[PDB]
Structure 1
Amino acid sequence: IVGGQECKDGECPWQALLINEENEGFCGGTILSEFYILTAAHCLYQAKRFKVRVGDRNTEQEEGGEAVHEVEVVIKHNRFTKETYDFDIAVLRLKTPITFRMNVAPACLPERDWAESTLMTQKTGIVSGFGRTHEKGRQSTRLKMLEVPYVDRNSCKLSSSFIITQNMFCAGYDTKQEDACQGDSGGPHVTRFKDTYFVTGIVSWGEGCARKGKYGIYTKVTAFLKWIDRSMK
């Protein structure tokens, strides 16, 4: 995350972190329920073996609430392609159920029509993660969150060197130096509505991080609500 703030105690309890065999984070995820993690399809190519870590806010310090979970099943969208990053969504089923507690809790899955009419028409969403603090920087050892404006679809298409499919939306800032970045991919984009947080996107891609005239590109979760429901069986 470029710019934005620390997640303070309890503020981003639906954050998951995909960690490699060396215990380094490489992608984010969202807790959907005791058993299921939402993430990006393209993250699954970023490591042979990985686990999921929840309840972590400071990677350099044991705060007590941390839990590592093993992945039992990887459910990747079959229509995902590296060529376009279209259908950039995947669900993970964990071997053992997540025990909800302080800093560990699911985000709500919305209903399609209402999310699109009511959530995605709000001023801003919230993206979070342990990713890079700037384009050329290193990964944050602190979990961060950032408020990102929904970006008009046609402005985004015009701003982009690559196709923006129906399964993507744009969020962030034109010139202001705030954005998601490398390592935040797969992570939560949520929208607050009356003190309740709904999953509205998955951190997908961008041309650098916080580059002028470029936005953050997110998987449009609302297009994948029947898919996610199916995947959670």
Structure 2
Amino acid sequence: VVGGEDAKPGQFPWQVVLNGKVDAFCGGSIVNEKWIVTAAHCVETGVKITVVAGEHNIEETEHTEQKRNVIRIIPHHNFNAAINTYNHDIALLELDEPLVLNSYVTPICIADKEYTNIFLKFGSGYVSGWGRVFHKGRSALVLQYLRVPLVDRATCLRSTKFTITNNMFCAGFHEGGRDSCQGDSGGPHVTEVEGTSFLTGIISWGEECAMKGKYGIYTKVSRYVNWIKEKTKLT
């Protein structure tokens, strides 16, 4: 996250960090004790993934962390159907052992399709992660967060030559300077509704970071809430 602030411990208890061949390479959000939702481009098959919930400072500890191994990965079936489009950029990770819920490990709420869209339409969401704090620069140690305004679709379309599908939305500022960035993918875009947060998007892609005239692009979660609910049922 470029231009954001340090989160306080337990401020975003649904945020998890993913570690693998590269440390802290993407983010994710807790759906329930056994499931994480993230971006499909962070987990294209192969490699071993480790999830850390209750994380705050990647190089310190307050003993709130819970590390789990990923036993199953489910990228949306249409992801990568069209080469290099980033359309359908969402995926689910099943944990080996359930997480124990507490003040530092809490699920993000997920409304139905209609309400997720209404919540997105509120126009202000929070994005968070341990990704780049400067375009082409270092990654964060302490979890970063930033409020980003929704951008009308027409303006979104005109900001880039790449295609913005009905499965994506733009968020950021006309002047730039504040944005999600490399490493923040898979992390959540959330909307707070009277003290309760709902997942409204997934950090997905962009052109560089925080550039004036450009915006961060997010996976539109409302189009995928039925799929999430169907794949993450607990037995």
TM-score scaled by length of structure 1: 0.96
Q: How does 1:16-95 map to 2 (within 5 A)?
A: 16-21=16-21, 24-45=23-44, 48-81=47-80, 82-95=83-96
Query: Residues 103-151 of structure 1, C-alpha deviation per residue, up to 9 Å, x if partnerless?
Result: 211110012112213x122131000000000111111011011000011
| Structure 1 residue aligned with 2:113 | 112
1:147 aligns with 2:184: no
Q: Contact 2:125/2:189 (CA < 8 Å) preserved in 1?
A: yes
| Structure 2 residue aligned with 1:187 | 187
| Structure 2 residue aligned with 1:207 | 207
Structure 2: how far apart are the matches of 1:192 and 1:179? 19
- Residue 6 of structure 1 and its aligned partner are, at CA, apart by 1.0
- Residue 174 of structure 1 and its aligned partner are, at CA, apart by 2.0
Q: Contact 1:26/1:46 (CA < 8 Å) preserved in 2?
A: no
Structure 1: how far apart are the matches of 2:68 and 2:178? 31
Q: Contact 1:128/1:144 (CA < 8 Å) preserved in 2?
A: yes
Query: Bigger CA drift: 13-22 or 217-226?
Result: 13-22
User: Taking every aligned residue pair, what percent have the same amino acid on both sides?
Assistant: 45
- Residue 102 of structure 1 and its aligned partner are, at CA, apart by 2.6
SS in 1 for 2:43: helix
Q: Contact 2:176/2:214 (CA < 8 Å) preserved in 1?
A: no
| Structure 1 residue aligned with 2:231 | 231
SS in 2 for 1:71: strand
Query: Bigger CA drift: 200-209 or 170-179?
Result: 170-179
| Structure 2 residue aligned with 1:171 | 171
| Structure 1 residue aligned with 2:220 | 220
Q: Contact 1:20/1:47 (CA < 8 Å) preserved in 2?
A: no
- Residue 47 of structure 1 and its aligned partner are, at CA, apart by 6.8
Q: Contact 1:107/1:198 (CA < 8 Å) preserved in 2?
A: yes
**CA 47–66 in structure 1, closer or farther in 2 if over 3 Å, else same:** farther
Structure 1: how far apart are the matches of 2:49 and 2:112? 31
Q: How does 1:1-20 map to 2 (within 5 A)?
A: 1-20=1-20
Structure 1: how far apart are the matches of 2:120 and 2:48? 35
Q: Contact 2:40/2:79 (CA < 8 Å) preserved in 1?
A: yes
**CA 58–187 in structure 1, closer or farther in 2 if over 3 Å, else same:** same
Structure 2: how far apart are the matches of 1:97 and 1:46? 22
Amino acid at match of 2:93: L
| Structure 1 residue aligned with 2:124 | 124
Gaps of 5+ in 1: none
Query: Bigger CA drift: 202-211 or 100-109?
Result: 100-109
TM-score scaled by length of structure 2: 0.95
What's the Cα RMSD here? Answer: 1.3
Structure 2: how far apart are the matches of 1:34 and 1:227? 18
Query: Residues 26-74 of structure 1, C-alpha deviation per residue, up to 9 Å, x if partnerless?
Result: 0000011001000000001397211111111101101110111111110
